[PDB]
Amino acid sequence: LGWESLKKLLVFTASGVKPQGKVAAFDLDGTLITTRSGKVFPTSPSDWRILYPEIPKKLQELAAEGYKLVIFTNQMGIGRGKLPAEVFKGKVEAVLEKLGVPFQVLVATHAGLNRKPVSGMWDHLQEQANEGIPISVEDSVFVGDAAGRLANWAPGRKKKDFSCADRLFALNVGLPFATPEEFFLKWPAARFELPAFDPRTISSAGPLYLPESSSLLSPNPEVVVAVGFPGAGKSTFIQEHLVSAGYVHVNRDTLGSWQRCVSSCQAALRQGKRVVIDNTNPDVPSRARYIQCAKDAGVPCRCFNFCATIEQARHNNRFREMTDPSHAPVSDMVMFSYRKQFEPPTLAEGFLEILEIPFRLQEHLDPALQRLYRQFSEG
Ligand SMILES: Nc1ncnc2c1ncn2[C@@H]1O[C@H](COP(=O)(O)OP(=O)(O)O)[C@@H](O)[C@H]1O
Numbered sequence: 001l002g003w004e005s006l007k008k009l010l011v012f013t014a015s016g017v018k019p020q021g022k023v024a025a026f027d028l029d030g031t032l033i034t035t036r037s038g039k040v041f042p043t044s045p046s047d048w049r050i051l052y053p054e055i056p057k058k059l060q061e062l063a064a065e066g067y068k069l070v071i072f073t074n075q076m077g078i079g080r081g082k083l084p085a086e087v088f089k090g091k092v093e094a095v096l097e098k099l100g101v102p103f104q105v106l107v108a109t110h111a112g113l114n115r116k117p118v119s120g121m122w123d124h125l126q127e128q129a130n131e132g133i134p135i136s137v138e139d140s141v142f143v144g145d146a147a148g149r150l151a152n153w154a155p156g157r158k159k160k161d162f163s164c165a166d167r168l169f170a171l172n173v174g175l176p177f178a179t180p181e182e183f184f185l186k187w188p189a190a191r192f193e194l195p196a197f198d199p200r201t202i203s204s205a206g207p208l209y210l211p212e213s214s215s216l217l218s219p220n221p222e223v224v225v226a227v228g229f230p231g232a233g234k235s236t237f238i239q240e241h242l243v244s245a246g247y248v249h250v251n252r253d254t255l256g257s258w259q260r261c262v263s264s265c266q267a268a269l270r271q272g273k274r275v276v277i278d279n280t281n282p283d284v285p286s287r288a289r290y291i292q293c294a295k296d297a298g299v300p301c302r303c304f305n306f307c308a309t310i311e312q313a314r315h316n317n318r319f320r321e322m323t324d325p326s327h328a329p330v331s332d333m334v335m336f337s338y339r340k341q342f343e344p345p346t347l348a349e350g351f352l353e354i355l356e357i358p359f360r361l362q363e364h365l366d367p368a369l370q371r372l373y374r375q376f377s378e379g
Pocket residue numbers: 228229230231232233234235236237316317319320323359360361362363364
């Protein structure tokens with residue numbers, strides 16, 4: 001073999017591979033190879049050819065210069081049961097034979113930590129798969145076609161890149177980056193864009209809530225109704241600021257229905273408690289029930305309106321998926337459904353007051369998780 005099957009990762013190490021202190025790493029599909037058929041997707045495991053004739057010679061030269069040659073490739077078809085692992089393995093081996101140089105190959109079979117642009121595969125190389133030889137990121141390079149290049153970026157290249165995953169993988173790690181044309185053909189740098197949402201720019205600056213004249217807490221019984229996307233940070237915020245103050249946390253996540261949120265709310269008010277309703281509550285009718293509960297109990301009802309944008313929330317959801325196994329994944333469809341349903345909270349509903357909660361960065365207490373949190377996690 002030379003193949004290893006690990007946790008959501010395949011690693012192949014060709015005979016002849018040596019650990020080195022610098023790496024020249026490459027995406028596979030559309031970077032080293034493309035379809036022989038000229039179709040966008042291969043019509044079978046045999047439907048491949050070396051992308052540019054220049055490739056094998058450049059690779060030999062890189063090996064001669066002391067770079068360990070590495071491939072990082074997303075193949076989530078494997079984890080999804082669409083592409084048998086052994087089939088992909090056979091294709092890899094056929095490609096490597098044609099290329100004619102020793103390679104180590106890492107294959108992210110699933111979503112999550114190992115899937116470019118997240119750095120999981122780089123980290124595995126650095127920590128586990130290089131025989132302890134430290135790798136200099138600055139002396140290394142990553143080459144891939146998923147580079148966020150814009151439409152009509154060169155003569156004969158009308159379509160924009162489908163993805164920016166390769167560029168973002170390099171950005172997350174700190175690797176110098178090039179496209180296959182820039183790298184193998186010495187084309188000038190093409191125009192590109194990164195995703196509009198940049199997790200590096202999320203700031204811990206500014207107020208915890210608005211308006212600053214208001215008070216986050218009430219000394220007396222009340223109902224607080226949270227509003228926000230899944231992934232807006234509702235439960236976390238509540239845990240940090242409200243539960244620590246003695247509020248009863250009514251969490252839809254753990255209660256399994258909104259009906260149980262209602263009954264739990266009524267129960268807590270009956271106990272003379274302060275209560276916060278943790279649910280998405282995008283629509284007027286959902287919120288209306290808790291306002292009514294407040295009324296029945298003769299207590300005020302406030303709204304905490306969590307301002308996280310849909311892309312901030314999706315980023316948080318992907319992060320949660322990578323760090324919190326207990327929790328179930330949130331699809332784009334659930335997110336678009338929230339967006340479809342969303343009606344801004346107003347005082348016309350009967351809230352005593354509405355506080356806006358900006359998405360303020362609160363850094364993760366484990367530095368490895370904080371590092372992860374700062375990574376682009378979507379191509
Ligand atoms: N202010 C913040 N800064 C950084 N990460 C956050 C912040 N708030 C929440 N998160 C993270 O984002 C993810 C979603 O948070 P969570 O409280 O579960 O959102 P919700 O309850 O609205 O679904 C979690 O992984 C959490 O650790």
